Every structure is written in C-alpha cells, then in structure tokens.
Amino acid sequence: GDAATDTVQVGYRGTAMEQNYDHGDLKTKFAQVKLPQSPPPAGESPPGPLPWKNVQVLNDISIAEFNRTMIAMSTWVAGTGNCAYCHNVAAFQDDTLPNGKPLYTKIVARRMLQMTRNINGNYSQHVKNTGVTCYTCHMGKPLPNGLWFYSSQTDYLRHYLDRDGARVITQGVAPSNANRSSTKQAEWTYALMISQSRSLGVNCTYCHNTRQFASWREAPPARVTAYHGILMLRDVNQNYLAPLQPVYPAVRLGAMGDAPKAQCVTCHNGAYKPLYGAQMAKDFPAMWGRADWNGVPFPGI
Amino acid sequence: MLEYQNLFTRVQVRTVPEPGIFSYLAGKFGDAQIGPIYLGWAGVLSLIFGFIAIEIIGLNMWASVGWDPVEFIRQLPWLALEPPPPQYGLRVPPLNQGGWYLMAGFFLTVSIILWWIRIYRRARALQMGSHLPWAFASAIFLYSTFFFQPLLVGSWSEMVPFGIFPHLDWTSAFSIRYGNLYYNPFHALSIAFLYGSAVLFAMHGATILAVARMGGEREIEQITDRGTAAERSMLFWRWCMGFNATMESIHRWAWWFAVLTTFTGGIGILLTGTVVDNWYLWGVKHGLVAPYPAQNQLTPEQQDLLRGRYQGTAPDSFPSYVV
Amino acid sequence: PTAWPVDPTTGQTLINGRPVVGRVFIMRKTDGTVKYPNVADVVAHEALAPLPPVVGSSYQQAPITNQRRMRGIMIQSTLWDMDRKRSATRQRYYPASTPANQL
Amino acid sequence: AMLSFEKKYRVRGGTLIGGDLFDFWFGPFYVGFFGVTTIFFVTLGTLLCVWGAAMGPTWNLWQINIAPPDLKYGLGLAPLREGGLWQIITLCALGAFGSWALRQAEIARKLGMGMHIPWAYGGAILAYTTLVVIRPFLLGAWGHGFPYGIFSHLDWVSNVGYQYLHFHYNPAHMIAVTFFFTNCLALAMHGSLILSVTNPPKGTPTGTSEQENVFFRDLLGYSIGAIGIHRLGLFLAVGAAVWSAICIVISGPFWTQGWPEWWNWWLNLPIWK
Amino acid sequence: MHRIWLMYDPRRVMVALVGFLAVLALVIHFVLLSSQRYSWIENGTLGADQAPVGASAPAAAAEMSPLPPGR
Amino acid sequence: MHRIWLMYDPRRVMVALVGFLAVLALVIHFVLLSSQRYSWIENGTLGADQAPVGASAPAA
Amino acid sequence: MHRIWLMYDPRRVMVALVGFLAVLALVIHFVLLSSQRYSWIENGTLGADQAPVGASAPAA
Amino acid sequence: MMEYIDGAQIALYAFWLFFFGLIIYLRREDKREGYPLESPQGPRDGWPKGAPKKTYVHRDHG
Amino acid sequence: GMTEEEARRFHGYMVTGTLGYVVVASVAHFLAWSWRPWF
Amino acid sequence: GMTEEEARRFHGYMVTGTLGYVVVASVAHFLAWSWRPWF
Amino acid sequence: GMTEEEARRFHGYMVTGTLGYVVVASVAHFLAWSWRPWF
C-alpha cells in the first residue's frame, strides 16, 4: 500500500505501454510541490496613464497588474518582497547601482520576461494552456535545475542548442544511400532518449511503441509534444539564454566562459508535466504572448 | 547439497595410485599424452595471442580512467575498448581512436582459431569423432559475423566494443538501428534453438538422473548394450509425448539444437544491414506484424513538420552567441 | 455512409430498403483493428523521410581538456548521470598539456 | 503399437488419482486421470484460441493476437471481447500445464523412475505462472500479462524491457542470460563427447568413458564425471528459468526506475564513494 | 511448564528462538529507521512536539495530478 | 474430543499452528501498516476523530 | 548456567561470537558514516550544536 | 526487380528445407532401438522408416 | 504416538493455551478499539 | 536424551532468562515512550 | 565432550570477557555521547 506500485496504461491493452510509479516515492514528490506552491496575489486593474520611466517589455499592462507582477516575480525568483534582488530600491527605474556597476539581475530579468512571452506565445504547441511562469524554472530560487555548459563535442545536450537531427532508422526495407547511420549514432540517440525519459520521470513507452521507435502512428500523441519541446529549447537557448554571456558575473559562467543553458529537466524537474500541471500562467497576463488565454481576453489597458 | 543417490554422499574413494591403469595417469592412449592439460603448439600459441589481446583490452580500460586503480575496479563494467570512428570506414584508424581495438580484435581472433586447431588435433589424437570441433566451429561462425557484417556494411565502427556493459549497449543499439531485431526471422529461429537447448538439457538431465540408480548415467554401455535404464527412458517419453529418442540419438538432438543456435544466429546478423535495413518493415511486408489501433494520427502538415533529419557530425566548435 | 437509413414511422433501421427488427450496429473486428495492407500503406501514415544529415566540411580539434578519455558512446547517460564522485569526475577529461617553452 | 520390448512394462499401478479406471494407453500415450484433464484443458484452451482468432482481424498465423484486458479492470474478469477471453485461456493453460506435470509423475512412478522430470518441468511452469499470475497480481491487474500471439507477445517483451529504459542492466537478467548461454555450451560439449566416442573415425574401436573423461578434463581442466554432467545440465537449464522468473518479478513490483540506476549502490560503496 | 523440553530438543528450540528474536529485532529497527517520525540517527535529538507526524489529510489542487493521464 | 490428537501428531500440529499464527499476525500488521488510517508508526498519535477515512459516496 | 557449554561446543560458539560482533560493529559504523549527522570523517570537528539535524514537523 | 521476393525470404526457405531434412534424419536415428513396433495385425515401422540396429566394434586387449 | 491418557493430558494444555491466547487477543482488540475504532 | 529432571532444571534458567529479557525490553519501551510517544 | 569442571572453568572466562567488553563499549558510548548526543 506504499511499497505498492501505481501504473498508468498509455497504449493499447496488450502492448505493455505502461508507466510504473512507486506509490510512496510519488506522493512524497507530489507533496513537496503542493505545499511549497506559492499563492498568487488577487487580480486587479484600475485606469491611468503609464508613469514608468524605463519599462521596455511590460508597457502593455495596467499599473496594478504591473505591481502585481513585480510581487510575483520577487516571490518566484528571489523570495517574496525581495525587490532588492533586482533593484536599486530607492530608484526602481535605474539599471545600475550607485557605483554605476550594472544591476545584472535586472538586465537578465528583462530578457527573461521576453523569453517567457516568447515561450507562452510561440510555443503553445508545447505548453498549451498550462503555460510557464518564472516559477516553472526558478521555483523560488535564483538558479533553476538542469543548467548545462559546454564540455565534450559529442555531449548530447547540444541537441538542445546548435545540433539538429537524431534519426537513425531507415524508412524502407532495403538498405540505401539515404540512411548511412552508424550503430554508434543509435547509441548516441539512445543516450539522449534516456535523458529525456529521466527528465520527465517516464519510460520510453510514454512516447514510443518500441516495436518501431520511428513510428508516429503507433506512438502516443505525447511524442508530438516532445518534438515541439526540442524546437522550443533550441530557440530559448540560442536566442535568450546563451547570448546573456556578457551580462553575467564570471561565477555564473562555464569553464569555457559560456552562459548557462536549459534542458527538458529545467521545467519538468522529473515530472510528466512541470509542477504536475499546475496552471499559473492564466493568472498573469503580463506573461502571455497571446491576445487571450483559453478564451479569457488580455486586459490590454 | 543433498542428493538422491548415495554414490558420493559419503564413502567416496581414493585411488592412491593412478586411475587409468583422486589421482591421474602419466601415459598414452595411443600417441596421445594423458597426464597434463593438453596444449601442443597450437595451444601454446593460442595463449600467447589471447593473453596480449586481453592485456591490450585491460590496459586501454585502465588508461580510460586515467590509470586510477580505484576507478579501474569501481567503474570496470562501464569501461570499454571502442571501435574506430565511422568516417574511417575500413581504413586503418588512429591508435587511440580504434587502432588498439582492431589490434585486440585481430589477436583475439587468431587466438580463437588456434584454440580450434588445438581441440581438433586433440580429438583426432584421442581417436574420437570430430563432433566437438564442428560444434565449436558453429560458435566461431557467429563470432566471425561480428567481423564480416561490419565489413559488408563497410565500417569497423560497427564492431562490438570490448566491455561488459558497453557490449550490451551495442546489442541494444544494433536492434534499434536496424528496426527491431525481433522481426529478424533468423533471430527468432536462433531463440527457438536457444530455448530448445534449455528444454532438451532439462529433459535429458532429469531423465538420466531419474534412472541413475539403474546405471542410466553409464550412457556408453547403455548405447552399446541396452539395459533396462535405457528402456525405461525411452518408454517414459513415448508414454508422455507419443515418441522417443534412443540413448545415442538424444545426443544428436542435443548436438543440433546447440549448433543451430549460433548457426542461424550468424545468418541473421549477416543479413542485417546488407539485405534488410529495417526488420519491422520486412515484417510488415511478409505479414509478421499484428495490427493495433492507431495511437495517434498526423495531419499532412505534421507529416512534413515531424520528418526529422538523419543524425550527422557533432559540432567541432563552441559557438559564442555574443551579438 | 456512417449509418443505414431509419424509417420515420417506427424508428426502425432500413437495410437495402427493408426493415430490421432490433438495434443495428456496424460489425467490426476486435477493437476495430485492421490488417496492415503493405509497407507503402504503413509508410503513408508516417512522417516523411528524414532529411539528409548535416556533416561538417572539416574537423577542428577541441582543446585537449575538452577531449573525453572514455570513448564509450552512452557513458554520459549510463554512468555520469548518476556518478558524481569528485576524483572520478576529474578523470573524465585529459589534463592540460603545454609545450615546456610556454611555461 | 508398442516398442519391441514395451509390453512387459505396461502394468497397472503408480497412479496418483483415480485408481484403475483411467490406467490405460491410447496408442503410444499413457492416459491416466491427468491425461483426461490434460485433453480437456488442451481442447478447451485451443478452441478458445481459435475463437479469439475468428473474432480478430485476421487468420494469418503470425498476426493472431489474443490480448489481455485493460489495466482498469484490475483483478476482475473483463468482458470476453475485451480481454476476458485471454483470462479463460490462461486458466486453461494453467490447468493443462499442471495436469501435464502430474501425469508425468504417474508415468515416472509406473516405471520406477525418480521424480526428476516433473520437477524440472516445474521450472518452466513457475516462469509462466510468474508472467501471467504472480507479477500481474503484485501489480494489481491481470492486464499486465503478455498477449497470446506469436509476434504480438514479442511486442510485449520489447515494451516491458524499455519500461526500464535499458533492461540489459537488470542484475537478475544478466544471471539468467549467463545460465542460458552456459547451458547451450554445456549441451554442445556433452552431446559432442558422447557422439564422438560412440561414432569414431571409420576403422577405429568404439571409445570409452575414460576417453571422454580425459577429453573433458583437457577442455575444462577438471573431470566432471558421468553423473556430474547431467547434474550440471539440469542445474543450468532449470536455474535459467528460475532466474528468469526472478528477473521479471522484480521488474515493476519491486524496482520501478531504470535498471542502469540500480547500479548506483555499487558506485557508492564506502571504500570508494 | 517443563514438559515442552522433552517434546522438543532444547538446543534446536534455543537456536530457533534466538534466531527469531534477532530477525524480529532487526526488522523493527529498520522499519523505524526508514520512517520519518523515528529516523533517530538523523533526528533523534528533536523534541516530541517537533518530530514528524503523518498527515491527518493529504493536500490537493484539482488541476494537479501525481500520475499522468491515460486509459 | 481429545482423540483428535491420535489422528495428528501434536509435535507436528504445534509447529504447524505457530507457523500459521506468526504468518497471519505479520500479514495483518503489514496490511494495517500499509493502510492510510492505520499507518500507526507515522500517524499513531492522531486522535480517533483526526485519523484518515476513505472516500464516501460523493453523489458526484 | 555453565551447563550451556555442555549443550554447545565452546570452540564453535566463540568463533561464531567473534564473527557476529565484527559484522555488527561494521554495520553500525557504516550506517553512521552514511548519515549526515554522524559523517564523522568529513564533519567530526563540528560542535554538537553545529552538526546537522534531520527535518522537523512544521510549526502548524 | 522482384518486389516481394528478397534475399532474407530466400534464405529462410533454404533453412526450412534443410531443417525438415534434419528432422527426418533425426527420427531415423531415433528408431535404431525398439523398432519395428509390435501390434495386432503385425509389425509397424512408423515414418520415416528407421535406420538399422547398429553393432559396435569393441577394442581388443589380447 | 500418543496414548489415550497422553492425548487427554495434552488436550488440556491445548484447550487452555488456545483460550488463553484468545483472551489476551480480545484485550488487545479492546485497547485497539478504544484507540481508533474501525467501525 | 533429555530427562524430566533436566527439563525441570532447564526451565528455571529459561524463565529467568525470558523474564530478564522482558524486563529490559519494557524499560527500553518506556524510555522510547518518554522520548517520542507513538500514540 | 567436556566435563562440568571444564565447563565451569570456561564459563568463568566467558562471563568475565563478555562483561569486560561491555565495560569498554560503555566507555565508548560515554565518549560518543559527550562528543555528539543522539537524543
């Protein structure tokens, strides 16, 4: 009853496409989310012309929704009420300290807003109406999980940055010049796929019928979502995270001096959906890249 | 453990002088020397070539953990000596990039062949049929396909890595690459004979122990001068399943089932990537594949979007995104 | 196309213009499964073939401190994903190496 | 029809159940009470497999697939068209395999043999019962059984393996494989040795236990002896099936992660953590 | 109540009893050491009001599920 | 009624009975320990009105 | 009580005893060395109020 | 240019013809003892017919 | 194998031992019930 | 083999052994209860 | 076997050596408690 195993069938009855969970271990992991999950500030929006001096992204939400967003951002990245993490608290408009040194955390967070809008807006085929907010990666802390840096050339995480192409199986009976993939390349795909399975806490049958890994018809629909996750991470890493290299202090950078990069586990944290599917982004229109969320229209001043 | 015959429970016996007219003879059955474990010229050479093969494998594994002897033991099942890179095809590769691999593979192969010579010569010298050397030849046939199939597809990169878990990674990846080896009919046959070998030796082992108190284990006497132990063994199976072997012919069934395991295995490997590149699709063609209801359906737009790309080279640079 | 006509008088299914007594259902085999016709039909339900690989036109060596000592292809997933012993981590890459001139 | 020495052995006695009523032969076959129950279960279970093929999509031998129920039915009998038929066939199979072993015990008793053969076959029955009764029971649904179909059960084996990402890393599976492979080697050696003394090169005397003893000692460096090689074969063959049953019953009910990460305990021994 | 010592050999009973009690003691200690409330090596210094207690009720949110959807 | 002990050896029956009772007791303890309401190592100090109860008929 | 040494052979008893205590000692040390609180090779120099403590209940 | 016929299928039937030849051979060897069978209406050979009973030449020692 | 008088003597201990165990177990259930009733 | 006198004298040590063990275990339980009650 | 005289002699050492070992373990727990109490 606690050493018991929960199982979920995800394919046709005789196929053994099934997910197995230790019951005890799973309710432990679930509780460790469901208690720390942070309460949002209540909704509001009054009128008025925007007073902001140096607002470059959020200049499309009301003044209460803006202030509400800052309370959320501090709660999600830095602990609640910790506006000092990003700001010269006497001069919220400033992007530098009194010393003139840049408030690197504020410059990053401005880019993280653009990135979050880009995720929620352009990659709905992945995040759908669950969406993401700062809490998805940061979970109350400055550093997300799953940060990775340059190392070996053959490091499989570069599938999420500059590489493309993991396929190794032939779409035909006879050998051909079309597919000359090595068995070593199948080993590399296999290593990559173990990483994805662990990132979601699932097994291969969550996304494949392993009698034919290449097949989409025999695979669950989740495989299609997973593919959009790869395309999303490449955009996130190439256009937002990796180019932040000059902004960070050197203590945040890799041995090659590269900026930290994300991977599937950064959002998923070992769960099939991030935060077991907690739907927060619907509460924070500042972070939609969309004119409406699940039919609810954007407040739009 | 306890046993259902007295024969060596207690009152085991010592020949204080030698048996062969515990202890051992020093003499000859014909021209064959009977004392030491036999080697001859081929046995001696086989040990030298095989020693250097094993020594090359071990030293490369140990170098791969930076000579650390703690990590050499701790990480041992994950260590490997690995085949050359794919781009070399059949050309000689760099020493640290598969040159030691092909060297160890060569010395191991010669060592195996010389061990077959040894067994063949010893069987002749003891005035025995050549059944055992040809049984061993069937195993060598399967082993050799781990050279010939890489040769026929044109790259030493496709060879099996020397290493406990790494060769199992290769075994899985080979099935992944060629579209599920379960649909290779010679793999299916090889399994049928592998299982049949366990069926037969369970049946035969149990049968002979079930008549051992009547001398059934003295199978050469029962073959040349049939006793009641042989008769009862024949009748048990005849009454059980409607047909029976003899004391001699059950050893032929045993011989062929074992031999056909590696023989059909070798053919299935040689066919893979040379004649058939996707065994599941070969299974569809020839009607092996059971239909399941569709788990997903793609639009025409997804059929082009979800086409992947075949895997290429790793990036040989560390790009800056400074902009 | 999806169901036979129904007589408005009696709610009763008409097959080839004549009524059936009972509630008509369209017969199917177990779970609606259907034998795959051929390879081409199976392939017509899949995505298109993968694109040709992107292959580098020439090879630049990484710095020696970025070269793995272990050539085994899955090692990153099968071992290093769980092994985080400090000394074993250091051994994963070749150490820095410099011509004596440059010290 | 009878072997030319057989009639002498066809006595009454040795039956475990039913006395003299079923103690007779049908051609070569001994019947007995468990012969009757065997044919009952074989006929019923076979005809239900034929019915499963009839109501399925095809008669092609390779493609026939009688699947178990959905996991949502738990330990209940599903509707017959939805896996319930697989459950009835499973009860037939258990009845048949049990009857077959008990019938073998009656035959062995009638010939004055030991019980070794029924118990050896018990190792196969154990592995089957683990796959379709014990593991599905510990998981709480009969739908965890494998489908009855020549290739569709290989799809089940494939998918169960990849439920643990890299099933080769299962430690009991490595042992079971080692028994299966060593058994096949031992069978080839024993078969070859007996044949090569009984069938020497033409114009050579028939060989002896001494010659096979000498050759075996040259192969392994020790003398197993005639009783020992049959003990070893039985140990390897039955041990393979027992370790097979272990390796599958631990997969799911006891271990649910990938099998590679099981080996974390070896990496963390205090001598080298 | 001595007649039991003729009904069974004291050596075999003595060994069997000691074997049972040792096995039971190990089982109970490891069941406790595995628990949250009684993991005494890590938390034995906590006061009785500070030690873990199992929930009177687990928590939930309707949109969240510990298990993925399916079948 | 004592002549039952002529049909069965009490040296057997005592060992059989204690073996049965020990197994039955361990089963019931582990069944309860695996339950939610009676997981008494973690939740034993809850009062009877605070202990878990299984789902009712929801009408929903 | 010495009559127990007629019931059992001292030479076997004392070898079994030393073997038992050696195993038990090694088990207890490695169970402690594996903990956080008593990982004494790394943290042995910490003060008693400064060494780790396992997680409490919340204030609720 | 054959669509359906391919080398793996050709190989597999080559094996089947060999294998059934082997089973015939093995059943002939199984019948060197205890055959012909006894019945009412006379001797029976089964199928295939068995190979003859086999005499074994002993080693001399004089 | 028991005689009459041996069986009859043993039956006395066996009945009383059984009943004594059930009496102890009934107190255990009384305590358990007062702590956390199952109906 | 075991005599009735042997059994009688053995039973004395067996009962003080058991009683001493139960005394230690019950003190151990009451220490545990005082440290961290399970009800 | 062994005489009762030798059994009693052995018992004298056995009980002494047991109690001596338990005394040293007591000092070891005294020292361990002084350094880092577990309650």
Ligand SMILES: CCCCCCCCCCCCCC(=O)OC[C@H](COP(=O)(O)OCC(O)COP(=O)(O)OC[C@@H](COC(=O)CCCCCCCCCCCCC)OC(=O)CCCCCCCCCCCCC)OC(=O)CCCCCCCCCCCCC
């Ligand atoms: C894949 C790799 C591993 C695959 C692993 C495969 C292993 C295969 C092992 C089994 C093969 C041996 C079976 C056997 O010999 O049984 C005895 C029986 C009869 O001959 P007999 O014993 O010498 O004589 C007795 C008889 O003459 C008189 O006896 P009686 O009067 O008392 O009783 C009545 C008769 C009536 O006959 C029958 O009822 C049997 C008819 C069906 C035989 C089918 C055999 C299997 C063929 C498999 C090959 C293929 C067929 C397509 O005799 C009997 O009662 C005898 C009952 C024997 C029951 C044996 C059932 C075995 C079923 C095996 C199923 C195997 C499934 C794989 O023999 C036969 O009937 C002939 C069989 C000859 C071997 C098959 C060779 C096929 C070669 C290719 C086609 C040749 C065309 C001419």
Ligand code: BCL
């Ligand atoms: C995901 C993994 C894949 C898979 C991939 C493969 C691959 C790849 C191969 C097999 C092969 C085999 N598989 Mg498969 N296999 C899978 C699933 C299974 C299942 C199952 C229940 O699921 C089973 C029962 C099997 C069973 C089998 C065997 C029938 C067969 C090997 C025969 C043999 O005896 O080899 C063992 C015998 C040998 C290897 C011969 C060795 C003889 C030499 C001479 C020994 C030399 C020793 C030397 C002197 C000393 C060495 C020193 C060291 C180098 C240091 N596979 C799935 C589908 N399988 C092989 C085959 O034949 O395929 C057709 C093969 O190559």
Ligand SMILES: CC[C@H]1c2cc3[nH]c4c(c3C)C(=O)[C@H](C(=O)OC)c4c3nc(cc4[nH]c(cc(n2)[C@@H]1C)c(C(C)=O)c4C)[C@@H](C)[C@@H]3CCC(=O)OC/C=C(\C)CCC[C@H](C)CCC[C@H](C)CCCC(C)C
């Ligand atoms: C029919 C198929 C099955 C099969 C059969 C089979 N294998 C066989 C045989 C047969 C019939 C043999 O007769 C042969 C044998 O010898 O058996 C004992 C063999 C054999 N099967 C082997 C292995 C094997 N078989 C396997 C499988 C199978 N074998 C199949 C299941 C497998 C698997 C499943 O992976 C393995 C690993 C070997 C044990 C043996 C062949 C031995 C051989 O070729 O050895 C070559 C020599 C070396 C590797 C060198 C050893 C070096 C020493 C360790 C160094 C010591 C120092 C040295 C002395 C220095 C030199 C000084 C000089 C002056 C001497």
Ligand SMILES: CC[C@H]1c2cc3[nH]c4c(c3C)C(=O)[C@H](C(=O)OC)c4c3nc(cc4[nH]c(cc(n2)[C@@H]1C)c(C(C)=O)c4C)[C@@H](C)[C@@H]3CCC(=O)OC/C=C(\C)CCC[C@H](C)CCC[C@H](C)CCCC(C)C
């Ligand atoms: C000890 C372990 C090994 C072992 C040993 C072994 N097997 C044995 C014996 C022994 C010692 C026998 O004495 C016994 C025998 O009599 O052999 C001739 C037997 C036997 N091993 C058999 C098969 C067999 N053994 C296997 C495995 C093993 N056998 C192990 C490796 C396998 C595998 C791995 O696939 C198979 C297929 C039979 C030839 C025979 C048992 C015959 C028997 O029980 O007959 C009565 C039943 C029938 C004739 C038919 C029953 C039909 C059912 C009612 C319906 C079908 C249900 C079934 C589950 C469908 C499955 C479909 C598949 C596609 C999945």
Ligand SMILES: *[C@H]1O[C@H](CO)[C@@H](O[C@@H]2O[C@@H](C)[C@H](O)[C@@H](O)[C@H]2O)[C@H](O)[C@@H]1O[C@H]1O[C@H](C(=O)O)[C@@H](O[C@H]2O[C@H](CO)[C@@H](O)[C@H](O)[C@H]2NC(C)=O)[C@H](OC(C)=O)[C@H]1OC(C)=O
């Ligand atoms: C950090 O530095 C930036 C520099 O750009 C300051 O940004 C200025 O004020 C913003 C409101 C405005 O949006 C922006 O365009 C820019 O005008 C930012 O306010 C922070 O200021 C502190 O540090 C400044 C610095 O660069 O060192 C410093 O600036 C003054 O001194 C430097 C030389 O040390 C000189 O280059 C600047 O021109 C000078 N600026 C002024 C307006 O005097 C600020 O000092 C003052 C008085 O502004 C610092 O601000 C404070 C309150 O300490």
Ligand SMILES: *[C@H]1O[C@H](CO)[C@@H](O[C@@H]2O[C@@H](C)[C@H](O)[C@@H](O)[C@H]2O)[C@H](O)[C@@H]1O[C@H]1O[C@H](C(=O)O)[C@@H](O[C@H]2O[C@H](CO)[C@@H](O)[C@H](O)[C@H]2NC(C)=O)[C@H](OC(C)=O)[C@H]1OC(C)=O
């Ligand atoms: C460093 O260089 C390597 C080798 O080109 C790049 O890896 C390539 O891309 C991967 C998808 C693939 O795995 C690998 O096989 C290889 O094809 C790696 O990503 C880094 O890329 C940057 O540097 C590239 C370079 O080769 O110098 C550069 O490529 C472009 O520029 C060079 C020089 O003018 C020219 O030779 C290339 O043909 C050209 N290629 C393209 C596609 O434009 C990359 O620039 C671009 C836009 O790709 C660099 O990438 C980045 C983001 O800086």
Ligand SMILES: CC(C)=CCC/C(C)=C/CC/C(C)=C/CC/C(C)=C/CC/C(C)=C/CC/C(C)=C/CC/C(C)=C/CC/C(C)=C/CC1=C(C)C(=O)c2ccccc2C1=O
């Ligand atoms: C279902 C039906 C049609 C019923 C009709 C009515 C009937 C027939 C009623 C009669 C009563 C009964 C119970 C009949 C049984 C009918 C059934 C179910 C028959 C099926 C029999 C059956 C299991 C056949 C499978 C055959 C196979 C493939 C076996 C695999 C193993 C194998 C390859 C064996 C071949 C090698 C042999 C012959 C091994 C046995 C063997 C061994 C193992 C020795 O060690 C030994 C030692 C010394 C001398 C002889 C032997 C010997 O013969």
Ligand SMILES: COC(C)(C)C/C=C/C(C)=C/C=C/C(C=O)=C/C=C/C(C)=C/C=C/C=C(C)/C=C/C=C(\C)CC/C=C(C)/C=C/C=C(\C)C(=O)O
């Ligand atoms: C949550 O966890 C789960 C597990 C789930 C919860 C559930 C747990 C369950 C079900 C528990 C059940 C417990 C149980 C049930 O019966 C427990 C029963 C325990 C018992 C019976 C203990 C008895 C101990 C007796 C001892 C130690 C005797 C020692 C004797 C000595 C020292 C003397 C030796 C002799 C000497 C010195 C000389 C002899 C004379 C001689 C030789 C001469 O004079 O010759």
Ligand SMILES: COC(C)(C)C/C=C/C(C)=C/C=C/C(C=O)=C/C=C/C(C)=C/C=C/C=C(C)/C=C/C=C(\C)CC/C=C(C)/C=C/C=C(\C)C(=O)O
């Ligand atoms: C958190 O971890 C978990 C594990 C979870 C926590 C739980 C732990 C548990 C359950 C622990 C259980 C502990 C236990 C239970 O029994 C512990 C029992 C311990 C015992 C009994 C120790 C006894 C030691 C006795 C010794 C050393 C005797 C030495 C004798 C000597 C030296 C003299 C020998 C004679 C000599 C020299 C002369 C011979 C005569 C001669 C020659 C002559 O006479 O000639």
Ligand SMILES: COC(C)(C)C/C=C/C(C)=C/C=C/C(C)=C/C=C/C(C)=C/C=C\C=C(C)\C=C\C=C(C)\C=C\C=C(C)\C=C\CC(C)(C)OC
């Ligand atoms: C100091 O001494 C030390 C301590 C180092 C000694 C210790 C050594 C140790 C610990 C060794 C450990 C070895 C292990 C664990 C080995 C594991 C091996 C395994 C599991 C191997 C499995 C499969 C390997 C296969 C199938 C390899 C096949 C290779 C073949 C067939 C290669 C053939 C190559 C040929 C025929 C020719 C090559 C030469 C060219 C291409 C030029 O042709 C002429």
Ligand SMILES: [Fe+3]
């Ligand atoms: Fe034999």
